[PDB]
Amino acid sequence: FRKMAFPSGKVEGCMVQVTCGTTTLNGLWLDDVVYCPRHVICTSEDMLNPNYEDLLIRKSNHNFLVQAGNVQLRVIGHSMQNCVLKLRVDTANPKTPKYKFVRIQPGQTFSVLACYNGSPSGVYQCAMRPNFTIKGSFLNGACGSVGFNIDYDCVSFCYMHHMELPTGVHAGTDLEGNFYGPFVDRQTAQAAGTDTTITVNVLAWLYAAVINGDRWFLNRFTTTLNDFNLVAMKYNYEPLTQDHVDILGPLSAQTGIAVLDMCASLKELLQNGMNGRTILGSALLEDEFTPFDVVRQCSGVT
């Protein structure tokens, strides 16, 4: 059982390089529009307190160099939507997949295609943390890298990368330029909220463990939502809602372990530790697999 990313080919054909002045980063080329972080128009002078509308009026179409591989794309228009810049180019991307822009919720997972100088370099699975950061792996130049899910042939883009917080976690926007979390695109003192653990995902992963033959943590007991949430709060876990319990319905039916039966196991795992054992080859309780992730990996959905 592994963190599995979506196949990235449909997204790779959308990645381009955008250069504005001395700043290079990545853009997403779909139809005749390249999307990228609006902070590409910042100089080190105005990174501290940018006036983006003023900085954008000062720029012209020619201030943006857009390169799809070795081919230059001519920019014929520019505009801003929230914190993303939209560069109209004269050529529609012939590799544009079926796609949509979606905003995800904390706890949901997605694949990240990390890119540098417009070139895809690596792919990995991420989750949107409860504090709206993501624990990514990004070097300088990674901005404009995107996160996505694939459903049938349709790519749902949910994340565009903007910045790294002092603690090393990452912050970005959806593809309409709306930030995830209480963050702003300016170089200033910013810190994530105290993070919490994604309870429903931990449960999903315990079900994955059971499905894969790791059963030592199961017990005879059950609990109540009310009782478990008092433990969840104590251990900095997200509260468990009736909606979560229902989403775990399928896994409860396949394994014959009811969610509040699995909560009793989880409660004991939190209250007494793991007694030097492991679960799915992990010494920690993993919280970046959704219920859907568990089913898809134990069902082989293409």
Added chain:
Amino acid sequence: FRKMAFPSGKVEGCMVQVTCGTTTLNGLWLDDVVYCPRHVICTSEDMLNPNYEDLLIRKSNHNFLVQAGNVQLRVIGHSMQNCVLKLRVDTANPKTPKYKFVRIQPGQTFSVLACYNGSPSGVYQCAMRPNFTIKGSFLNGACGSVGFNIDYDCVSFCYMHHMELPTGVHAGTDLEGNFYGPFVDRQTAQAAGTDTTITVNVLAWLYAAVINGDRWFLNRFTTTLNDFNLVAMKYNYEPLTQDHVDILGPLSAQTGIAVLDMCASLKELLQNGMNGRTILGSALLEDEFTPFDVVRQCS
């Protein structure tokens, strides 16, 4: 720090579906050849002691149904090279990337594109264990999925999937059809050797932790190579060779921590554990990042 796979697009355009009898698995379509596991030609009565030469001579081109998406590829000829079947088709794959076939050694990492019915389902990072198995994630029908690395725009194919061992780990071939390890494509009792931890990789990972600002596991001690190996074997770690020490030279220079000094830290980590702490997000010592992997992800 993440287990990062290579972008899979170049491999995706090569995956096809191969059917023989009642068996369908995946094939790898490069130029005008489709590579797949030869056990596609087995029936239910053939799985214990198949005579592949005898099964193959009885096959005609039209017994192989190859589909690339909704397009059916016409099989022009077939031959067997070790444990892979090479199906000649009348159409070269126009999406054929720059590629090569490489055989890897234990400790090496690669990306796996897990596929079913010729459709890619997911991508993940894997390593060749010292006992020549891989700890993959494969369901029924995953045979023919390949493992690969990409350097510049060249795909090096290094693994094709054939079977699951009773312990749940996985066995397969290089793209010339030679199995990794003592395994054979028979459903006979086969035993994965005792596995060990890939020491040189754990060290590389500890260097990565130092690069990203963790020094809490260092200590004032050094060790001889021999003394390190005597201790580490007691934890079922692979022997560290002088080759391994040389390989770690660049990471040693960048961090200023001599290889044998990092070996001293590892000895202490094995002795103490982490005492409630984590290293690069893990509560265990990670051994599926190589020295090259660390360099690529940190710079």
